Design a protein around this nucleic acid. Structure first.
Lengths: 97, 31, 119, 181
RNA sequence: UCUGGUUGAUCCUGCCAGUUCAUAUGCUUGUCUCAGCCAUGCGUCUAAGUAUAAGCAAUUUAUACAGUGAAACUGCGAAGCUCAUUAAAUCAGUUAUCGUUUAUUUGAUAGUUACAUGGUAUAACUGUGGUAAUUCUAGAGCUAAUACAUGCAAUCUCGACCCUUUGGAAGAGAUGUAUUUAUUAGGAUGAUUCAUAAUAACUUUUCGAAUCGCAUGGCCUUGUGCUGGCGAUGGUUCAUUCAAAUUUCUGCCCUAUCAACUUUCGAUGGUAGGAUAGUGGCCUACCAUGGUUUCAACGGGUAACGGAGAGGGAGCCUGAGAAACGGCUACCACAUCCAAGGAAGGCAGCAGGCAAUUACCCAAUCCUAAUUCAGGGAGGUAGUAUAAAUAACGAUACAGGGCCCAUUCGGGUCUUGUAAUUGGAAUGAGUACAAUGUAAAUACCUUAACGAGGAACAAUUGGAGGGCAAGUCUGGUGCCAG
């Protein structure tokens, strides 16, 4: 199986979200897709998939682990209003100009 | 003796409030 | 600049406080091609991770700054570090005495100053 | 542009490569320790010569020099941690008494042969370069790896290796499929 | 530098022979990893300044228009290279500007026909034409502004009556800003003719909203009557901020084989004037003959890379800030097109050799603007000496020779040889499904399936020896020798 553990959960009222360090335990497998990670994060925190913005995943040497950063906006509209344009596009929330 | 003599030298080479701690505290309240 | 490595080596034995050792397999640089990280490499690396965690993004290395921080840091290794223990400080010449010497103004200068220190 | 960079050589050619004694020495050493060429011995001899040059410098200094006690005890701690220098002989004259075959003995190849994981030094080398030997949790494929005492303890077959518990190699499953077919 | 000869054997002096991050050149691998000449090519839009596009779309969102909007008029901003060289005259630190200018930011700051004036106005636009011809053009006809001009029944004191004793109140009075000159008074600093106020005038006398977007509240005297909320764009002065310009003192080379330098079309200073944004010989009119220096003036050399221009000089124009890598005039040369009547250029460039500088972006750090959104070859992204593998482990068959020393003769030693057959395992280069990575993408990391017996999935370089023919040559004392 695969485990996701979040730490340093800093809730940001001014950008109206929650930022955190996401650590991924993945024995015997390549790594986790960001769509996949966003799925599980959003069931856990009870938020829409458009409101979850994960990024920056690096597998430590030897494999089996990864560390990166994650954001969970208080609302989907806020997620569009604050996220980078490219970070919206990589989800399909915005179209390439 | 010489080991200590090095230690005071570093102490010499190296109201009470830390700007970073005050920055960590708001991050913790943010937490 | 004042710090010179092996004095902290004595401190570590004489501290009487543990030293937070890491796992054996966690310390190979890359599959053995780069030897075990020196003790210094494990502090400067953790400065990055400790420095990364708060800012919530990584640091990329500039193409220029990459050309004096990676190779020589691991060419000193193959020239100095054998099995992850530094041997470069041994060949290098430094005025070890000055770093330890009580050069600060609070030093013995007259008979009374040293007589105070006995008290 | 920006500042250039310092790099150094890990080995040096001997004064006279051509003594018959010298050649027979590399023959013995490569045969016993399965060394690929003479560059490994040139490297180890260079490194050992550097250590001895430091050690004789310290023997020259008067006892109770800060420099001497400092530099020598640091040398002794490092040589102990790499496992070359035994616990009972922590003094610089015995640092002056080392011999290269100790450093070759500390090569990961030698432990892979010695612990019984490999039947020969060459078998140890092919196992290492083929990623079947793990130092604890980490796969290592360099025979020239210097193994510490704590690292010497934890030599094992890797989890991903077919000999460590993973699935049979391509040849085994291929032959099994052909047998089934 | 060493090693062996030259003796019956030694020492010394001689002779002989062998004993490089220097340069060229050759083979292999680079399958992984890793690091003066050449004609050679080549700006800007928000709800908020102006729409009658004979543009677009919508239909009730429009009978003044109302969304969007080409063009044009306004507003804002346009401020890497290549050559030379210069000793505290560059630069660095620091002082002063009571001796100055200053877009913008920020805080204050102007009671002294109007239910809104004119073309004293035209672009875009319609239409007629000339020219070989241009960011070349003449005639006729329109139409606008935050463009161009013009311009409009209040307040405060002394306060009798001491009427009422907060209070009303007779009467007397008083009332912009900007420039210049003269005059009077004079909270701030150490210091002022500083600040401010007043009087008399002056001025090609300044300014003191004829502007725009969203909303439609409170009242009543139902008239669309009175009174209005949030912003934008404008405007005088001061301060603040961004800067700029001068200015006080200090700051590691050798120097006298560099002893006088200056007044050499100002050298030192005073008076007065001209100009600057202002101080000041900066310059001008008169006057004095001064100023630095053996405590090193002045001059010379230098590993003082340890300031100049955009074809060459002269001159002008804009703006807060440039004597502008912008534009304009004449001159000196270069050179292009042409109907030979004229027109136009700064490429007299750039980049190369003695040859691919390209493709993708404003995301990341930042910025200019009528600005959230536009853009930036600022910037970013990509393109083109260091560790491994070529193999590891068994079984069987068949044979007795294999090796070492020694000039000499010979001596010493024992598990060996295969140019024999055979078995099951391991995995890398490659063939590659994915995700991740990222502005996107490449690369990195991770990871399904396939992937070895000539493992032909066929690394090289150099040297030392052989031996073979109905073969060839040359010289000999046959069958030999070269």
């Amino acid at each position: 199986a695969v485990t996701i553990r979040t730490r340093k959960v800093i809730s940001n009222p001014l950008l109206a979200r929650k930022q955190f360090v996401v650590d991924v335990l993945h024995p015997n497998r390549a790594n986790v897709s960001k769509d996949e990670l966003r799925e599980k994060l959003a069931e856990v925190y009870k938020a829409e998939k458009d409101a979850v913005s994960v990024f920056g995943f690096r597998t430590q040497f030897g494999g089996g682990k990864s560390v990166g950063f994650g954001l969970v906006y208080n609302s989907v509209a806020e997620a569009k209003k604050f996220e980078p344009t490219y970070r919206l596009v990589r989800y399909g929330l915005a179209e390439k100009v | 003796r010489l080991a200590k003599q090095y230690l005071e030298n570093l102490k010499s080479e190296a109201n009470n409030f830390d700007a970073g701690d005050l920055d960590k505290d708001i991050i913790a309240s943010r937490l | 600049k004042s710090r010179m490595q092996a004095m902290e080596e004595y401190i570590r034995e004489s501290s009487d406080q543990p030293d937070w050792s890491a796992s054996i397999g966690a310390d190979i640089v890359n599959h053995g091609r780069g030897g075990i990280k020196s003790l210094r490499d494990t502090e400067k690396e953790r400065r990055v991770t400790s420095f990364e965690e708060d800012n919530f993004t990584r640091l990329n290395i500039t193409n220029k700054a990459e050309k004096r921080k990676q190779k020589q840091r691991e060419r000193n290794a193959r020239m100095n570090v054998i099995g992850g223990e530094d041997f470069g400080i041994f060949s290098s010449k430094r005025k070890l005495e000055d770093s330890t010497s009580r050069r600060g103004a609070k030093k013995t200068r007259s008979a009374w100053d040293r007589a105070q220190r006995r008290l | 542009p920006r500042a250039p960079r310092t790099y150094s050589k890990t080995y040096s050619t001997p004064k006279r490569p051509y003594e018959s004694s010298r050649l027979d020495a590399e023959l013995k050493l490569a045969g016993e320790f399965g060394l690929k060429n003479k560059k490994e011995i040139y490297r180890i001899s260079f490194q050992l010569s550097k250590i001895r040059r430091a050690a004789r410098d310290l023997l020259t200094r008067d006892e109770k020099d800060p420099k001497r006690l400092f530099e020598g005890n640091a040398l002794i701690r490092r040589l102990v941690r790499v496992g070359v220098l035994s616990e009972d002989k922590k003094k610089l004259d015995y640092v002056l008494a080392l011999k290269v075959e100790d450093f070759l003995e500390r090569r990961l190849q030698t432990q892979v042969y010695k612990l019984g994981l490999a039947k020969s030094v060459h078998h140890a080398r092919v196992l290492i370069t083929q990623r079947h030997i793990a130092v604890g949790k980490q796969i290592v494929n360099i025979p020239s790896f210097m193994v510490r005492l704590d690292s010497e303890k934890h030599i094992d077959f890797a989890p991903t290796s077919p000999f460590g518990g993973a699935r049979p190699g391509r040849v085994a499953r291929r032959n099994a499929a052909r047998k089934a077919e």
